[PDB]
Design a protein around this nucleic acid. Structure first.
Ligand SMILES: [Zn+2]
Ligand SMILES: [Zn+2]
Ligand SMILES: [Zn+2]
Length: 133
DNA sequence: GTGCTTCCTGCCAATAACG
DNA sequence: CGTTATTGGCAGGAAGCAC
């Protein structure tokens, strides 16, 4: 067991721009609009927590970067098109497909795709993957 | 330039600590 | 369920690598 603490540290600095408070990493002076985003980033400098793969000996500095890489190892077709029903492994291939085949914008107000949960590997499952209508 | 893969980062929900 | 602190999954393209 360890003694819990509820304190901040000098691992960043604040910079006010156009009224907005930004948070900046001390090492590389990268700016962030959210502290949550900054904390995620600082793990790339500290290497306090490693995120090693299962199928190879590779290590990532972020949990989500590992997960997305492992989705490419397993081949989980998360993104399904709704126009032609075709399934894709990530957003980048899906967007390219919808543009080249259907000549439509998935970031528009049509919504021509649906996201299915990942079952090939273990992750937290948001209630919008479970069932939405 | 075309094609494959990983990185960036605000946004949002989930986890943990304390009541 | 209400605050404080961090994890870490999502959208969507830019950047890097291969040709
Ligand atoms: Zn930094
Ligand atoms: Zn791997
Ligand atoms: Zn389609």
């Amino acid at each position: 067991a360890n003694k819990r603490m509820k304190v901040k540290h000098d691992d960043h600095y604040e910079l006010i721009v156009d009224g907005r408070v930004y948070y900046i990493c001390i090492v590389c002076k990268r700016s962030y609009v959210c502290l949550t985003s900054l904390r995620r980033h600082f793990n790339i400098h500290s290497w306090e927590k490693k995120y090693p793969c299962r199928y190879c000996e590779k290590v990532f500095p972020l949990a989500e970067y590992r997960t997305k890489h492992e989705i490419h190892h397993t081949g989980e077709r998360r993104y399904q098109c709704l126009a032609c029903g075709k399934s894709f492994i990530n957003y980048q291939f899906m967007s390219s497909h919808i543009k080249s085949v259907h000549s439509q914008d998935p970031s528009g107000d049509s919504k021509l795709y649906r996201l299915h949960p990942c079952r090939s590997l273990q992750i937290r499952q948001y209630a919008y993957l479970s069932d939405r209508s």
